[PDB]
Design a protein around this ligand. Structure first.
Ligand SMILES: *[C]C1=C([C])[C]=[C@@]23C(=[C]1)N([C][C]([O])[C]([O])[C]([O])[C]OP([O])(=O)OP([O])(=O)O[C][C]1O[C](N4[C]=NC5=C4N=[C]N=C5[N])[C]([O])[C]1[O])C1=NC(=O)[N]C(=O)C1=N2C3#C[C][N][C]1[C][C]C2=C1[C]=[C][C]=[C]2
Ligand SMILES: *[C]C1=C([C])[C]=[C@@]23C(=[C]1)N([C][C]([O])[C]([O])[C]([O])[C]OP([O])(=O)OP([O])(=O)O[C][C]1O[C](N4[C]=NC5=C4N=[C]N=C5[N])[C]([O])[C]1[O])C1=NC(=O)[N]C(=O)C1=N2C3#C[C][N][C]1[C][C]C2=C1[C]=[C][C]=[C]2
Lengths: 499, 494
């Protein structure tokens, strides 16, 4: 019944919030809908895989909050394998490469590719991380989809195709589904195009030894019986002196404050008294999560390494069920595995199939891409379709369709009386990621500490010292990358010389 | 506790479903979240207005189901005033006109306007009403917004501005918010551009004497204590022999079948056991409702009629809080009033203001557009911001953002075990309207009758005889309207 703060949701954000509050001496309760904590993180354990992350998994440089929290919990990271060559598979052919990005040889195509990424980052610099709706061209950019932006910027199909895959992979949505302003904000607040996408020096550099689910689990261990599992919140009443929070199994909790640490749209599952203010009421119907099946195919050995492939495949084309893979082999070199994402519309399309049918399709794809018959001999398979989850709504995160972020973005983390808002979606750095979950959980907790008069206003948002274990190299450009013209730029230079 | 069918939602669709089932001899219970029935319809009564529709109000030709149901309930309609001239107000100036549509004089502009509406209807003919995702170009049209389509088709700013207002008014959303495929389907399934937008011979021809709220109210009267008010459904369990439906006030209902007669996204307010199938689970997060404040300003007299204006104003431009009005005066000629809609982003923008501030802005706008100081002297004001409604989500209806209808549209009315889906959103004719609410409620009820073996499969979908009281005139085109070239067409001919 009675406590200081009810935290709705026991994912990383809710758990990080509860831990901060608990450490500060408050009585906290975590109400978790599922029979488990972790939410969009889920580490499955069995003898065949030992452990496997079926949800969020990767951490990297500049994600200092999750790294600190995980380290404090006694967790270690290891590096995702990127020793050997990456593969870019396009028009039925594999092109192995080193360095972070697929090489482009055609001079015009090179100009187009260079300009596109540059322009994405250029536009991003005009977008405040904490207020994307304040960008000078916010309305213009919000009123077009990423598809329209690609159509305008990409003068080659090659660039347009790679850019599309980039969007699909980053936010598990189609280019036509998402606002350009939102996507540009999303990339920028993850440190830019290079940082968001890279393995070495980027968001995918590392995984936790033992799985990411240990973050939430070990916090639950610390909190003990303060975490209530199988307590979906159905009702929040703020009409009386103390906030009343009711669960589906007919329990009532009474608190001074509430943190909502659930995906924004899942706020819809709660009936509010009094009703939410108009802007939030409508916002939570406007913010879907993306669509993904995360699939892990196990093999006797990491055979791709013998062919000087690290296991990273960037796979273009409608026929390919999986557009991106990473080596998921354990740091010890055993439980050899390829992790692949079935993205956006393909998650919808292929969900109809059986698990065995999806396995077959993946193996046949990998055999082609790796040029290896061994890919047809899996020893085990695990998958998770996040679209089916009632208490997630999707993965990885919430996307904003055209027009929504400028109209409703302001209210995402605006408190509603005594309800404060956590969740990765409310983060200003690495939103959509485990890192953002930590930032948002701890910020929301500190908003409550400030409301209680326990800390000053300037302590609500707190900077994080850089990890000593995972230092960040800066993202650099060359002179040529900076100043090479776009395709229309080159054409204007031709026009002026001809005239 | 125990009944044959639980209907979730006591709007027109839920009520029409419950009435059909009740009339067939089944024991029905209606679980309604609010302390009233009617949902997106709401008729307020007081001495100042007598009655006023603050939600859905208008009915017209080809809406034969709502007309039949209302007539059976003892309701009558009257005609919205369109005797005198309509006004098109653009770039700060009022252009009175007769006939249904604002005249365009510039030849190039005329060609562009003519082509646009014609193209909208041409495209709609390729969109199956019962399966828009089966349109030949479904993906192409679904993957662009209405803004992109208008940008492609409209060679004049004049056409683009009127087309934008048309979209804003029809679906209370911005052109950039909505899928082109969905919007083209929406218009087509209301009988086309002329039918959806027209007062005389269209969707806005008539209102119910006494208010539209009477449809739901009178069905509640028939059903008596079978209607449970202030029973928001929170939980549906289909794991056992009978379906279990739980409400917020801790009541449990047990039924053979359930009809969900709530806006699709409001399905999110219910926790499901077992979980919903993946496609519906995600669909109900992808389908918002539009944004509108419906405002009615009352005057001593319908003074605009004296200036030979009917009260219809089509008002372009960002500064105007209200883009569209109709005369809301009673058939008797008293309680003179102008009904206006504050649409889409303007509903969001102006919601910050006080009721009094909104009244002032509307009166000043109407004074300008009507060229009448009398507009500055209101005697009363009523308004409703549908964006604030927990158990509606918005008005008038659900819109589909780009990419959604083709990917998820199939599951909108697909049964989930013993749950069948009503609500205007699931209609195939006049979806988004009170007519669609009736169609969907009666169809969902008949799906359950068929599942019980009471009626054959071919009786699930039932045709409706035309109203004798509100007959439909056909929508016609002229030879020139049909064959005049577009702007690019004229350029190719040059
Ligand atoms: C799913 C997923 C996947 C598959 C993958 C991934 C992911 C995911 N991600 C994301 C993450 O995970 C997230 O962000 C997190 O986790 C979040 O957190 P939060 O905020 O906390 O949330 P959640 O988890 O959801 O939680 C919540 C909770 O609550 C609950 N509930 C609900 N409702 C309710 C409740 N309770 C009570 N009551 C009520 N009513 C639930 O149950 C839960 O528990 C990620 N992230 C990171 O960081 N990393 C990673 O890795 C991940 N993953 C991904 C990724 C991807 N990546 C890719 C590759 C390449 C690239 C990319 C991207 C970009 C660029 C490049
Ligand atoms: C709001 C509105 C307005 C302002 C206006 C209008 C409208 C609206 N509309 C629409 C209508 O109203 C609709 O459609 C109907 O009503 C619907 O129905 P239904 O389907 O049945 O639905 P609702 O109502 O919503 O109901 C539901 C119910 O449920 C309940 N819930 C929820 N949740 C829950 C519950 N319960 C239990 N549990 C749970 N959880 C609720 O509460 C409710 O009750 C319309 N329509 C028609 O027809 N008419 C009219 O007039 C209308 N309005 C509008 C219109 C406009 N118009 C415009 C002018 C010119 C033009 C236009 C358009 C187009 C073209 C042209």
């Amino acid at each position: 019944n009675k406590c200081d703060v009810v935290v709705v949701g026991g994912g990383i954000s809710g758990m990080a919030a509860a831990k901060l509050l608990h450490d500060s001496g408050l009585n906290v309760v975590v109400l978790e809908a599922r029979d488990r904590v972790g939410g969009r993180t889920y580490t499955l354990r069995n003898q065949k895989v030992k452990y496997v992350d079926l949800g969020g998994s990767y951490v990297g440089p500049t994600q200092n909050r999750i790294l600190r929290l995980a380290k404090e919990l006694g967790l270690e990271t290891y590096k995702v394998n990127e020793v050997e060559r990456l593969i870019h598979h396009v028009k039925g052919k594999s092109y192995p490469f080193r360095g972070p990005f697929p090489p482009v040889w055609n001079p015009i195509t090179y100009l187009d590719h260079n300009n596109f990424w540059r322009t994405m980052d250029d536009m991003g610099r005009e977008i405040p991380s904490d207020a994307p709706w304040k960008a000078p061209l916010a309305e213009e950019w919000d009123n077009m989809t990423m598809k329209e932006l690609l159509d305008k910027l990409c003068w080659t199909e090659s660039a347009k195709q790679l850019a599309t895959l980039f969007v699909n992979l980053c936010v598990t949505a189609e280019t036509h589904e998402v606002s350009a302003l939102w996507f540009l904000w999303y990339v920028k607040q993850c440190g830019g195009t290079t940082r968001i996408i890279s393995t070495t020096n980027g968001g995918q550099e590392r995984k936790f030894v033992g799985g990411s689910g240990q973050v939430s689990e070990r916090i639950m261990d610390l909190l003990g019986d303060r975490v209530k599992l199988e307590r979906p919140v159905i009702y929040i009443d703020q009409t009386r002196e103390n906030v009343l929070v009711e669960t589906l199994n007919h329990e009532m909790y009474e608190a001074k404050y509430v943190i909502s640490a659930i995906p924004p749209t899942l706020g819809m599952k709660i009936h509010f008294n009094p009703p939410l203010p108009m802007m939030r009421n409508q916002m939570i119907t406007r913010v879907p999560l993306g669509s993904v099946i995360k699939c892990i195919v196990y093999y006797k050995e990491p055979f791709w390494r013998k062919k000087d492939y690290c296991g990273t495949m960037i796979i273009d084309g409608e026929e390919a069920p999986v557009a991106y893979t990473l080596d998921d082999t354990k740091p010890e070199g055993n439980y050899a595995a390829i992790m692949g994402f079935i993205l956006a519309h393909k998650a919808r399309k292929l969900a109809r199939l059986t698990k065995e049918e999806r396995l077959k399709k993946l193996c046949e794809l990998y055999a082609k891409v790796l040029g290896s018959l061994e890919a047809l001999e899996p020893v085990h398979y695990e998958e998770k379709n996040w679209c089916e989850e009632q208490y997630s709504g999707g993965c990885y995160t919430t996307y904003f369709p055209p027009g929504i972020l400028t109209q409703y973005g302001r209210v995402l983390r605006q408190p509603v009386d005594r309800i404060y808002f956590a969740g990765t979606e409310t983060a200003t750095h690495w939103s959509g990621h485990m890192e953002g979950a930590v930032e948002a959980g701890e910020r929301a907790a500190r908003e409550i500490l400030h409301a209680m008069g326990k800390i000053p206003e300037d302590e609500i948002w707190q900077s994080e010292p850089e990890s000593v274990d995972v230092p960040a190299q800066p993202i650099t450009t060359t002179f040529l990358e900076r100043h090479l013209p776009s395709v229309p730029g080159l054409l204007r230079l031709i026009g002026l010389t001809t005239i």
